Amino acid sequence: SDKYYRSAYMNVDLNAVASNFKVFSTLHPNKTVMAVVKANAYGLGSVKVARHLMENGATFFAVATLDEAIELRMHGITAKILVLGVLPAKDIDKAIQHRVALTVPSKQWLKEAIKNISGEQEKKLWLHIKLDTGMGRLGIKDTNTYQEVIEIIQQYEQLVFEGVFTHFACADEPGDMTTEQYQRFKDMVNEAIKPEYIHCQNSAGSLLMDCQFCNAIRPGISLYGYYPSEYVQQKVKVHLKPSVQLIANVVQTKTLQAGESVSYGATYTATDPTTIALLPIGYADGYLRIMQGSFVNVNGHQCEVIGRVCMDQTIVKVPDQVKAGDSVILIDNHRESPQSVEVVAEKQHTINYEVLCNLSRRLPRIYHDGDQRFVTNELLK
Amino acid sequence: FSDKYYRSAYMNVDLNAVASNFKVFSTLHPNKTVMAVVKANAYGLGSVKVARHLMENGATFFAVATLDEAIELRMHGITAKILVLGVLPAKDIDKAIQHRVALTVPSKQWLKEAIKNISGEQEKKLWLHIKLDTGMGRLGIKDTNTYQEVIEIIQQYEQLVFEGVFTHFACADEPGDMTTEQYQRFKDMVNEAIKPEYIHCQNSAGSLLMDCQFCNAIRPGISLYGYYPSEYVQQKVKVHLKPSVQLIANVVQTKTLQAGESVSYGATYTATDPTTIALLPIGYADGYLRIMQGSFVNVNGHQCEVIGRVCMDQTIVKVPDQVKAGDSVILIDNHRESPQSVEVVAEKQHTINYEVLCNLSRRLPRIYHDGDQRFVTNELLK
Structure with missing residues (x-):
């Protein structure tokens, strides 16, 4: 591992x-x-x-x-x-x-x-x-x-x-x-x-x-747990289990006061006093620029991706209680989810197949098989 | 090695x-x-x-x-x-x-x-x-x-x-x-x-x-790597950068569609005239994304439209009759003023040059050129 x-x-x-x-x-x-x-x-x-x-x-x-x-x-x-x-x-x-x-x-x-x-x-x-x-x-x-x-x-x-x-x-x-x-x-x-x-x-x-x-x-x-289309999903009566989650933890939070901005590819200026969270994931990981404006799940809370997605970093608007260490679900292993692969495909103006294929070698794959867990990290092979 | x-x-x-x-x-x-x-x-x-x-x-x-x-x-x-x-x-x-x-x-x-x-x-x-x-x-x-x-x-x-x-x-x-x-x-x-x-x-x-x-x-x-961070910067500074990347694939099969015959998923391109098509062994799992449909690639000097849907491992191109299996296709060219420049590919992708480059997946071998020397990195066979 x-x-x-x-x-x-x-x-x-x-x-x-x-x-x-x-x-x-x-x-x-x-x-x-x-x-x-x-x-x-x-x-x-x-x-x-x-x-x-x-x-x-x-x-x-x-x-x-x-x-x-x-x-x-x-x-x-x-x-x-x-x-x-x-x-x-x-x-x-x-x-x-x-x-x-x-x-x-x-x-x-x-x-x-x-x-x-x-x-x-x-x-x-x-x-x-x-x-x-x-x-x-x-x-x-x-x-x-x-x-x-x-x-x-x-x-x-x-x-x-x-x-x-x-x-x-x-x-x-x-x-x-x-x-x-x-x-x-x-x-x-x-x-x-x-x-x-x-x-x-x-x-x-x-x-x-x-x-x-x-x-x-x-x-x-x-x-891998996805239907090739919604038509097929609706027409058949089997159950498929989505196999992928994409996760990242908040590495930093900052609170922007009214009239204050930060620039992550483009300016986001806080109108009200708002908290932002920095995720260590970006478009070089396959979480593409078009994901700007989508929502991710931070500790149960639906949170907007703001400013531009950068190569290695993504900023998210979050509640005040969110802090460094908190886990974020960017792609969830459920069909009926705002972070489902199909919803991410809609935001990407593409199909689920491509969402999955985009995910780059920089992401470790953590394999689950019962209680057993093993990690593949291509960069250290 | x-x-x-x-x-x-x-x-x-x-x-x-x-x-x-x-x-x-x-x-x-x-x-x-x-x-x-x-x-x-x-x-x-x-x-x-x-x-x-x-x-x-x-x-x-x-x-x-x-x-x-x-x-x-x-x-x-x-x-x-x-x-x-x-x-x-x-x-x-x-x-x-x-x-x-x-x-x-x-x-x-x-x-x-x-x-x-x-x-x-x-x-x-x-x-x-x-x-x-x-x-x-x-x-x-x-x-x-x-x-x-x-x-x-x-x-x-x-x-x-x-x-x-x-x-x-x-x-x-x-x-x-x-x-x-x-x-x-x-x-x-x-x-x-x-x-x-x-x-x-x-x-x-x-x-x-x-x-x-x-x-x-x-x-x-x-x-x-040979690209400007924006067109403004390109126009403002009078220095020369050399694009370092080409993306290449060779035609594996050519076929002729008759009036009425379709190509790829959903049958989104149907032939009206009898036209020749070429199949390339590259697709969106390589980072040549679905949105590249309708862009142009350079086959043996000829600008050729990408038709039908881009597949995970395959791309279809409308080509002249003389095109045949083995012919080389430039999908991304190492020149700034090219219809296959990284910036034009970025426009087609509704993104920026940075992401075009980052999309290119591990499945693509990188063939490094250094004078006469050529060496290949192929991640799958590590």
């Missing part, structure tokens, strides 16, 4: 994460739950989340990049891992060496990948073909190309057609786009041999749909 | 530019200590590599925001003086002492709490820089009597050394008399007690716009 030397941090509740994972296993008992731990597990810390999820039955992870997969492998993760992004073809041997499954986005990529296999790694290359069913991002859109790519893969004993998958553009909102995409996915997959893993559902799809034709799901944000 | 990296998205960090920008401040203030501000991981560039490179270019004193930042420097061989600008939790006082890290005194109360936590097990000198609140600016000691009492407390203990005194000016990057009135208040306060070794009030804007003979040290920050 690392030390840390500033009173700002994230509480990461690993018991909540395990409980949320259990929700997906329970909803889909016959599917492999491919736990999405990309982008450092949406800010929570991919190594600690993956380790904890393996102790709770997880056997397959998905990440965005090979670096993310190697990071898991370096820290004892023995489960299957799929890279969802496109690997630079020159790095093919490293994927093979570390038994990491790769996404095939195109016939062109596959041909470049094969040319870079040196023969010095003879282990299998496991491949999941990505189909573009209307998202318009990565993948093969044409059935003929899909078949040609399967055939190329079957010509090489080293290359294994392990899976096939697609991504839904609008699964978190009502409309027929998702039904249409799903039908297109089944139509394409039924035109060739079926691989071992067939998957299309992220959090929203995993919560709203059965998808009997598929045998794996890819829950991401919902593993 | 140089880390490997396994996705074609990265930052180019030009260490020669950083050294050149540092040299600007040394040259403008040849008799002052240039206290190089490398807080927040050197505004995203990487504090360890910037500090090492700046030490090789004559830097002898760094400022950081937190003790963790200072210890990080110490663990990677940085032997220069270091000042922590933030308020240290009083229980951590022995760790500051152990690692010869100077601390900011913000209040008499803090100093009294700090002294109570000195165990006697770390006997090195504790260097202290007193922060003054000169009216308008940041919090600190506001009253001269309290300033004197704090000096007196420090002089009671041989272990505690009154090493410096400082303030931070409100609005030094904008036109007005606020800076002048504040500077005068700073001098008035400092002249009421013995002068410590370091006297400092100037950040980037103050270091560029003012001499300040009364001071013997400056604290340049964002300008070390």
